[PDB]
Design an enzyme around this catalytic site. Structure first.
Site, PDB file in Angstrom:
ATOM      1  N   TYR A  22      44.252  32.048 -17.308  1.00  0.00           N
ATOM      2  CA  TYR A  22      43.392  32.736 -18.265  1.00  0.00           C
ATOM      3  C   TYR A  22      43.007  32.116 -19.583  1.00  0.00           C
ATOM      4  CZ  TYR A  22      43.207  36.447 -15.041  1.00  0.00           C
ATOM      5  OH  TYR A  22      42.908  37.244 -13.967  1.00  0.00           O
ATOM      6  N   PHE A  75      52.083  41.927 -13.607  1.00  0.00           N
ATOM      7  CA  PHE A  75      50.767  42.387 -14.069  1.00  0.00           C
ATOM      8  C   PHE A  75      49.751  42.752 -13.019  1.00  0.00           C
ATOM      9  CE2 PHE A  75      48.396  38.563 -13.169  1.00  0.00           C
ATOM     10  CZ  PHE A  75      49.320  37.533 -13.303  1.00  0.00           C
ATOM     11  N   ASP A  76      49.988  42.418 -11.759  1.00  0.00           N
ATOM     12  CA  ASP A  76      49.030  42.772 -10.725  1.00  0.00           C
ATOM     13  C   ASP A  76      49.599  42.520  -9.336  1.00  0.00           C
ATOM     14  OD1 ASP A  76      46.520  43.838 -10.074  1.00  0.00           O
ATOM     15  OD2 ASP A  76      45.735  41.777  -9.738  1.00  0.00           O
TER      16      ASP A  76
END
Lengths: 121, 121
Positions: free
Chosen positions: A94, A52-53
């Site tokens: 998160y 994702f990153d």
């Protein structure tokens, strides 16, 4: 990567919320203290392998609550030059809000972080 | 090098900067998380027996650098109801500067901390 290594639970509460596996040991001796500007490169994965990153430096203040919780806890345990893998439960990352649309709510995540340097408060 | 009675190194650098002795096991089932607001009662003494300050509630948000480093490190590991004794190195405390006139340069400090509760946040 690599199997003799077991995720050591570094969560201060020892609730298994952050499991660290040292992928590459630092050859140095120096380590980050709360308040320091740290410089790292990282990659982030969802458990199913979705990347994702990725910084591929990313920099920030350690222990100020500026980055994910799993991060404030992990980076305070790395030698300069060390590469590690941390497995993060939702609440150390998160939480239930996630990060639309790349990260769902309640996501256990995996980070490969390499510590390059840091500079005193 | 600390004697067994000074407690366990709970410093993420495992450099002996924060030695915690658990004086009363917490009975609670929750422990604070980075960013939560904690209420505590503390007393601090220089190693020589000198009491420099005592809150006999003190409140702050954990893991943000609002208190001495040794407190963000220690409290992150406590249960509610728990009473502990922290022993900290100047650098996890006041370092070279100290806090004239009561806390000299490079003073190793000892704290008795009791976690009463913390708010979700």
């Amino acid at each position: 990567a690599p199997l003799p290594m077991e995720g050591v639970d570094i969560s201060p509460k020892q609730d298994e919320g952050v499991l660290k596996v040292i992928k590459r040991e630092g050859t140095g001796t120096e380590m980050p203290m709360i308040g320091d500007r740290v410089f790292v490169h990282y990659t982030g994965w969802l458990l199913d392998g979705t990347k994702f990153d990725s910084s591929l430096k990313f920099s920030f203040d350690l222990g100020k609550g500026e980055v994910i919780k799993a991060w404030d806890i992990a980076i305070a345990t790395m030698k300069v030059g060390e590469v590690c893998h941390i497995t993060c439960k939702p609440e150390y990352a998160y939480g239930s809000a996630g990060s639309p649309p790349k990260i769902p709510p309640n996501a256990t995540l995996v980070f490969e972080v390499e510590l390059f340097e840091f500079k005193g408060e």
